[PDB]
Design a protein around this ligand. Structure first.
Ligand SMILES: CC(C)(Oc1ccc(CCNC(=O)c2ccc(Cl)cc2)cc1)C(=O)O
Lengths: 12, 276
C-alpha cells in the first residue's frame, strides 16, 4: 500500500 | 566444531546462497578485484578522473541507462546522480530476486517481506559497493568504467559528499578480506534482521536468521583460519551500515530541500518513505 512497487516486485 | 548432519546442512545452505548470489548480481567481488588489478582478459575500465575524462567517458562507455534521444541535465553532478538512481533501482530488483532464493523467506508474511526488503536494500548495496571499491575509486557501469574517489569529492555541494562515507566504509570493510562465499551469507543475514521497524511476525524471521548466522560462522571459521574474530567484527559492521544509511538519508534531504525538484525514482521514494 505504502510500498506498491516493492509489493509488485515480491509478487512476481 | 564437528562434522555432523547439522553442519552438512549449514554447508549445503552456504552453497545454495552462493550459487544464487552468483546468478543474482552481475559483478561478483572476485571479478571486481581481477578488474581492479588488471588481471583480466576483459578490456579495461575507462578511467574518469577529471571533467575532460568524464565527458570522454559518456561517449566511449555504453551506459545501460541512456540513449541518444533523452535529455539529460547539463550539470555533470546531476547526471552522475541520475545514473546512481538507475543503478540503485536495478539493484533493488537483484536484491529482491536474491531475497526470494533464501530458503523460507518466500513463506514469510508478504507484508514482512516488504519490510525486510525496504530496510535491507541499502545496507546490502553499501556492503556490495565495497567489492567495487579500492581507495582510489569505484568500478562503474558493470566494470566498464572506474570513477576516481577524488573526482567524486569534487562534485559541487552537496553531491561531492555522497560517496566519501562509502569509500571510508569500504576501506575498513575490505580489510576483512571477505570473498563472495562469505558475502552471500552475510547479505542474507542482513535481509533477515528481525529487529526492523514494523514487523508483524518476528519469530519465523529470527528462526531463519539464526540458521543464516550459523551458516555464516561455520563459513568464516572454515574460510579464514588466520582470523580469530571475523564473525564478530563482521556483525559489528552491520552497525556501521545502519549509520551509513542514516547519514545518506539526511544528505538526501539536503537535495530535494535545496535542489531543483530533480526528484527521486518512485521505487527509491518508497524505500526512503518512513525509513528512520
Ligand atoms: C541513488 C541514491 C539516491 O544515492 C546513491 C548515490 C550513489 C550510490 C553509489 C553508486 N553505486 C550504486 O548505486 C551501486 C548499487 C548496487 C551495486 Cl551492486 C553497485 C553499485 C548509491 C546511492 C540512493 O540512495 O539510492
Amino acid at each position: 500500500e505504502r510500498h506498491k512497487i516493492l509489493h509488485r516486485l515480491l509478487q512476481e | 566444531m564437528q562434522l555432523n548432519p547439522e553442519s552438512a546442512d549449514l554447508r549445503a545452505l552456504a552453497k545454495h546462497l552462493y550459487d544464487s548470489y552468483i546468478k543474482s548480481f552481475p559483478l561478483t567481488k572476485a571479478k571486481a578485484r581481477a578488474i581492479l588489478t588488471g588481471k583480466t582478459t576483459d578490456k579495461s575500465p575507462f578511467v574518469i578522473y577529471d571533467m575532460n575524462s568524464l565527458m570522454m567517458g559518456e561517449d566511449k562507455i555504453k551506459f545501460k541507462h541512456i540513449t541518444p534521444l533523452q535529455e539529460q541535465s547539463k550539470e555533470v553532478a546531476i547526471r552522475i546522480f541520475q545514473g546512481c538512481q538507475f543503478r540503485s533501482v536495478e539493484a533493488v530488483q537483484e536484491i529482491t530476486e536474491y531475497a526470494k532464493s533464501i530458503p523460507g523467506f518466500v513463506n514469510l508474511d508478504l507484508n514482512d517481506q516488504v519490510t525486510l526488503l525496504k530496510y535491507g536494500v541499502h545496507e546490502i548495496i553499501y556492503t556490495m559497493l565495497a567489492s567495487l571499491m579500492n581507495k582510489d575509486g569505484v568500478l562503474i557501469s558493470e566494470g566498464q568504467g572506474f570513477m576516481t574517489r577524488e573526482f567524486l569529492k569534487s562534485l559541487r555541494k552537496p553531491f561531492g559528499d555522497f560517496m566519501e562515507p562509502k569509500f571510508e566504509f569500504a576501506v575498513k570493510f575490505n580489510a576483512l578480506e571477505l570473498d563472495d562465499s562469505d558475502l552471500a551469507i552475510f547479505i542474507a543475514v542482513i535481509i533477515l534482521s528481525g529487529d526492523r521497524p514494523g514487523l508483524l511476525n518476528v519469530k519465523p524471521i529470527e528462526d531463519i536468521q539464526d540458521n543464516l548466522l550459523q551458516a555464516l560462522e561455520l563459513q568464516l571459521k572454515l574460510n579464514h583460519p588466520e582470523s580469530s574474530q571475523l564473525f564478530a567484527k563482521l556483525l559489528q559492521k552491520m552497525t556501521d551500515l545502519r549509520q551509513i544509511v542514516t547519514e545518506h538519508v539526511q544528505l538526501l534531504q539536503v537535495i530535494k530541500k535545496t535542489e531543483t525538484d530533480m526528484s527521486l525514482h518512485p521505487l527509491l521514494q518508497e524505500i526512503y518513505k518512513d525509513l528512520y
